Design a binder for this molecule. Structure first.
Ligand code: FMN
Ligand code: FMN
Lengths: 368, 352
């Protein structure tokens, strides 16, 4: 069986990169490699990281007297800082309290929880941690329309206030850890098993992964947007034409992502794709950005480049490994404090001022 | 005295350029040159026009089955099409029904009327033409703090839903009064131009934004840093304009300045764009480049000269119909689709 860490404690987060190596000491090797790894030789995961050096922050004089305020609003919900939790499968690979632990951290901090369809936790377990906090539900597009009806009803029943339609799947990702390590999940998918039980699709992990279309179309977006009764974010957008087609099909948001470099290999770093998408979106729908956010400076650069919020992923799971909900809360607190420092140095009093930053174009890239 | 046109009639508007030469035949020479003219030898007015050829529209396949809809909303106000009326002084130079005529056209069509600081009509005359329709009030920054508090109180009591703070006052190689400014410039000789600051500062924007009780647009922005400073000072909107090339000479065409401003604004406040809009394609290009709406100026006044409120209405109708055709050819079903257009960069400019 699977020996996840179970300790609950606050952690002194000085930077999020060191959390990866610290988590590698407490997370079983197979689970750790599932979380940390990425496609191919991880060049596009490194590109996610290095892309932040392509656009650099300028320190700027202040024009306002007040203390910085990190709060913002998305879909009418006020959140403590311009970051949400990304949808991540199987939080139990990092900690025994699993998605309930992360939900407690996110709800206590004051932002939005994204629930993966591949949660290892029941919604009842997650609800305990959420304690009324806002939540969005991430889904894959099922080949069988009934399964889409089923998960949209599950999301409405669970008080979701948005759907995140992930554009890519059947556990994709040429060379993270399943072709190499030969590691398979130690637990189930109770959210989808609720509705797949007694169908062929529920019989195995392969059948669950295989129940999804491998890539969505604009027609798929239109069907989910028409029947969800909720705003739909399309997640995995890296090209501006796709953003335009998704909005025309009825998307209520664009979630710019390469899923933490877990799918297509030898693709751009996600941040390099953001400005072209934001210019084409041109204010029509909110933008969520993710894939590689590690520092407060990254949150600021994403806002300056057209994101309304960013989503956080691996660093929150590494925090959860190291301290359960308190460890995940420490990571959210780190980002909020670091963002406040960046606001002070850029002369920004609020999140709107961050959206107005001028960035320095660095044509030399990472080695400068 | 000044013999302005008085006929009220609809007009067949095939293009707005021909309205200028048609209006030149009915408007007294002095009044016409006041309206049509611009700074220096009019190079920057021509730049305003030629800038539209810098970014070209693509015809595109449709992705929706519905007929085009031009409706939009700004500051919660639903309007028929993504254009509003620009604040223009002294409509009585163009037609005897003056700002009341323009207000009737704008209210009958279904958009927002901007009332100039230097209106020749009383608020009561304009109010009758508006018949309840939405209006924004344009002001200059007074040197006297109490004059600013008084015009802001008057605007809000007259049902204004936004203030337009024009950043510049008056350039090139007035036979009736101003009842609205003279309605608080009696007692001391400011109504006898020297009453207003020639250029505003961020501190001025902050003073107006803090005392208006209404969203303030700052009008005349052409540089992105000024947009950022204005928003930080409490502006609720940016109005990208060179006032129809009537102020600074040997400056860029207004449309060429819009993308840099829109990228810096980055959705923080709505953008109004003006200076040179003459065709539906221009409305589409401004929206694709970050404007929420455009403002129309000279073409509506030429329509007023030719037909009073019905002539001005004819021009608004032309822009709406022309925009609908552009939407069909760009594969756009609605105004949000226009905001998503890709434009072709033309590095050759006008002569191609
Ligand atoms: C372990 C793991 C599992 C993930 N599972 C999902 C998933 O179930 N649904 C999904 O939409 N994205 C999934 N993602 C992608 C995340 O939502 C997010 O895009 C990514 O973590 C961002 O990259 P970063 O964590 O490196 O910053 C997963 C990512 C990780 C690391
Ligand atoms: C005759 C005339 C008078 C104007 N008076 C004012 C004014 O009182 N207040 C103001 O903010 N702008 C004023 N403007 C500028 C207009 O608001 C607007 O920016 C300009 O008409 C747009 O250029 P266009 O008409 O060539 O497209 C005036 C413009 C014209 C042509």
């Amino acid at each position: 069986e699977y020996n996840a860490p179970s300790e609950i404690k606050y952690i002194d987060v000085v930077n999020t990169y060191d959390l990866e190596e610290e988590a590698s000491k407490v997370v079983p090797h197979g689970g750790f490699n599932y979380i940390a790894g990425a496609s191919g030789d991880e060049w596009t995961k490194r590109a996610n990281d290095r892309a932040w050096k392509h656009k650099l922050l300028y320190p700027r004089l202040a024009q306002d007297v007040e203390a910085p305020d990190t709060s913002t609003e998305i879909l009418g919900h006020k959140i403590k800082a311009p970051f949400i939790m990304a949808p991540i499968a199987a939080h139990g690979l990092a900690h025994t309290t699993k998605e309930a632990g992360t939900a407690r951290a996110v709800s206590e901090f004051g932002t939005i929880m994204s629930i993966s369809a591949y949660s290892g936790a029941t919604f009842e377990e997650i609800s305990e941690g959420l304690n009324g906090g806002p939540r969005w539900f991430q889904i894959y597009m099922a080949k069988d329309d009934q399964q889409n009806r089923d998960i949209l009803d599950e999301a409405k029943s669970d008080g979701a206030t948005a759907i995140i339609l992930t554009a890519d799947s059947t556990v994709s990702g040429n060379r993270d850890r399943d072709v190499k390590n030969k590691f398979v999940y130690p637990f189930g998918m109770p959210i989808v098993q609720r509705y797949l039980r007694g169908t062929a699709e529920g019989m195995s992990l392969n059948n669950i992964y295989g129940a999804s279309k491998q890539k969505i179309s604009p027609r798929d977006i239109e069907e989910i947007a028409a029947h969800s009764g909720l705003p739909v974010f399309v997640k995995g957008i890296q090209h501006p034409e796709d953003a335009d087609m998704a909005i025309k099909r009825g998307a209520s948001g664009i979630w710019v992502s390469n899923h933490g470099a877990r799918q297509l290999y030898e693709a751009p770093g996600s941040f390099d794709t953001l400005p072209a998408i934001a210019e084409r979106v041109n204010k029509r729908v909110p933008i969520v950005f993710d894939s590689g956010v590690r520092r407060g400076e990254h949150v600021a650069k994403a806002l300056a480049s057209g994101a309304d919020v960013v989503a956080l992923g691996r660093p929150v799971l590494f925090g959860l490994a190291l301290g359960g909900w308190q460890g995940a809360y420490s990571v959210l607190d780190y980002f909020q404090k670091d963002l406040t420092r960046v606001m002070q140095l850029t002369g920004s009093q609020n999140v709107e001022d961050l959206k107005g930053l001028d960035l320095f174009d660095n044509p030399y890239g990472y080695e400068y």
